[model samples]
Target: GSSGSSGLRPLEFLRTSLGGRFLVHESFLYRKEKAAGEKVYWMCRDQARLGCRSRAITQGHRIMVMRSHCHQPDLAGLEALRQRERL
Candidate 1:
C-alpha cells in the first residue's frame, strides 16, 4: 500500500529525505545554512558565478520560497547529458 503519497514533492524528498541536492526546474540548489528546529536554507548553485538569486527553504518538511530565480534555466545536468550523447 505504498502509494508514494508521503506528501513531500520530488525536490523536497531528495533534499530533505535523502539529504541530496535539489534540482529545481533546471537549477540545482545547494545547502546554504541550517538552523535549529530542522529548518534549512538552500541557495542556487550558480549564485556565485551567475549571480542567481534563487533560494528555497524548508519550514515543516515542505519547500518554501524566500526568493524566486530571475535568470534563465540553470540546466546543470546538461553537461552530463551532452557528454553521454557524444559517446
Candidate 2:
C-alpha cells in the first residue's frame, strides 16, 4: 500500500465538540462507518438527512474505492446542529 500511489485520496481528519470525528476530502464529509484489520470505511455524513448511499472503502489511511455521492457536499448544517444546543 505504501510502495506506489494508485488512485488513493489523502483524507482529512477533524473533530467537533470534542466528541465527533470526521473525514473531509474533495469537499465531501465522511463519517466513520465500520472497519476491520488494516482497512477503514466511511459513509457520507448525510446518511440521516439525505439517506446518502455513498460509500468509501479506504486503505490504511489514504482513501480508495470511493463511490459516487448523491447530494451536494455541505458542512454548514453539521456545526449548526450542535452549536444551537446552547439555547
Candidate 3:
C-alpha cells in the first residue's frame, strides 16, 4: 500500500535505488472471450522523460513478471545545462 502521490512505496523505493527508472501499467478491457472469439486485453505506458519502458498486466487468467535494467552510458555526460547552472 502507498499514500496519495506516493505511488507504490516499496516497489518505487526499490526501483529508484537502482537508477532513474519508471514503471508502466496496463489493463484488460473485457472479461473472457467475446462471441466473436476475442483473446485477452492488455495495455502499458512509458511516457516518462527518462525513456523508461516497463509495464504490468492486470486482467484475465495471466501472470506477469517484469525486469528492467537502467541503461544510458552514452548519456552520462549529456546534462550540460546542470553543469552551466553551477558556474
Ranking by TM-score: 2, 1, 3
Best model number under TM-score: 2
* Candidate 2 lDDT, 30-77, residue by residue in tens: 777888767778888877888877877667557764678778855686
Give lDDT per model, in order: 0.56, 0.68, 0.29
lDDT per residue for candidate 1 within 1-87, as digits (tens), equals 223676675542223334444434333544555555687777776687778767777665467777776566635553453344346
Ranking by lDDT: 2, 1, 3
lDDT for each residue of candidate 3 in 9-28, tens digit (9 for 90 to 100): 23211022223322222211
With candidate 1 superimposed using the best TM-score fit, by how many Å does residue 52's alpha carbon deviate from the native?
1.5
Q: Candidate 3: global Cα-lDDT?
A: 0.29
TM-score of each predicted structure versus truth: 0.51, 0.64, 0.22
In candidate 1, which residue ranges exceed 4 Å CA deviation?
1-27, 59-61, 76-87
Query: What are the runs in model 2 whose C-alpha is more than 4 Å off?
Result: 1-9, 75-87
Which candidate has the top score in lDDT? 2
